[PDB]
């Protein structure tokens, strides 16, 4: 049973916060995965990408541990990517699933040509970069699908991008640097200031401010 330990989990459990977009608006750090399980929940699907054995040499021999790369995603929504190392593959996968739920971002979607319908592609050209690997997402018209390698295709389809162009650079055989690079590019879709985001930001009250009278009873 979830007994929440943070100020935010006590607000999430007590129905005070109605969406994940409030936590994203105030950029609050999320330290419990049950917040994500509360909000997305029944529409959140995971894919193991690679089980990677790493070896440290020791005085007694070498310890072999196992590294799991788990991408999780709500299709049309949000996408996260967790990596966990452990001495056992099942615990590595479960810890990477928790750690992938924990690092879930929203992805902004846009239009290629005229804005008729629902958004279907990236809003602009975004580059992600992680350890020699460069991944660039280029907007594509309605219905081309994802034109990418099979590793960013997983993360991009989980993020809800219908159709995109992609270009990679570097040593993409390292699936870790090639998965986190596209995750860095997907996480940049809200940080890009485009002219429709030029209005002045009317501020609202933070959840730690509006519910300061509910939080003192606990």
């Amino acid at each position: 049973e979830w007994m929440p330990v943070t100020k935010l989990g006590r607000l999430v459990k007590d129905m005070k916060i109605k969406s994940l977009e409030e936590i994203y608006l105030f950029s609050l750090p999320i330290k419990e995965s049950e917040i994500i399980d509360f909000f997305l929940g029944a529409s959140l699907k995971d894919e193991v990408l690679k089980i990677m054995p790493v070896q440290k040499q020791t005085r007694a021999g070498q310890r072999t541990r196992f590294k799991a790369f788990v991408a999780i995603g709500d299709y049309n929504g949000h996408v996260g990517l967790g990596v966990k190392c452990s001495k056992e593959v099942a615990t590595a996968i479960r810890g990477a699933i928790i750690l992938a739920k924990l690092s879930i971002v929203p992805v902004r979607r846009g239009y290629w040509g005229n804005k008729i319908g629902k958004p279907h592609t990236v809003p602009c050209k975004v580059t992600g970069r992680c350890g020699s690997v460069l991944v660039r997402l280029i907007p594509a018209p309605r219905g081309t699908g994802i034109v990418s390698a099979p590793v960013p295709k997983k993360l991009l389809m989980m993020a809800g991008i219908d159709d995109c162009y992609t270009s990679a650079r570097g040593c993409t055989a390292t699936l870790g640097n090639f998965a986190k690079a596209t995750f860095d590019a997907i996480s940049k879709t809200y940080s890009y200031l485009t002219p429709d985001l030029w209005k002045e930001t009317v501020f609202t009250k933070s959840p730690y401010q509006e519910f300061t009278d509910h939080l003192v009873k606990t």
Binding site: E47, P53, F66, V89, I93
Partner: peptide, 29 residues
């Protein structure tokens, strides 16, 4: 058991087969 097969045989000749069987077990199908 694909987990135990993977953890025993990941270094041997049968490493790619137990990797494929583990990925089959993990990612549905």
């Amino acid at each position: 058991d694909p987990y135990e097969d993977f953890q025993e045989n990941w270094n041997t000749k049968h490493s790619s087969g137990v990797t494929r069987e583990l990925m089959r077990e993990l990612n549905g199908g």
